């Protein structure tokens, strides 16, 4: 199984449905993208990610110096 947003295989199960076998939830762990086993997600080409975009992504808020 691969991630729908960045295509990495470092994806794992996050949680099971608290009641029965309704569904599961998976997480990328390379880009934090999570999704439910029921909803088949199709990430728009605008919102996909690679190692390059995550590198120069910009932080909110800035990290201060250490003193």
Compute CA distances 9 → 27, 28, 62, whole Å. 11, 8, 30
Residue 52 makes contact with other proteins by CB under 8 A: no
- Residue 13's beta-bridge partner residues? 26
Tell me how many residues contact other proteins (CB under 8 A): 35
Residue 1 makes contact with other proteins by CB under 8 A: no
Backbone torsions φ then ψ of 51, nearest 5 degrees: -60, -25
Report what 23 binds from Zn ion, other proteins, none; CB cut-off 5-8 Å by kind: other proteins
Using the minimum distance from each CB to other proteins, give the nearer residue, 9 or 20: 20
Task: Say how far apart CA 54 and CA 57 lie, in whole Å.
Answer: 5
Q: Interface residues for Zn ion in 28-67 (CB under 5 A)?
A: 28, 30-31, 33
């Amino acid at each position: 199984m691969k991630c729908h947003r960045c295509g990495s295989d470092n994806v794992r199960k996050m949680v099971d449905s608290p009641v029965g076998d309704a569904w599961e939830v998976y997480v990328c762990e390379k880009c934090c993208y999570s999704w439910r086993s029921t909803e088949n997600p199709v990430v728009m080409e605008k919102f996909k990610l690679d190692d390059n975009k995550i590198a120069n992504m910009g932080v909110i808020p800035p990290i201060p110096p250490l003193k």
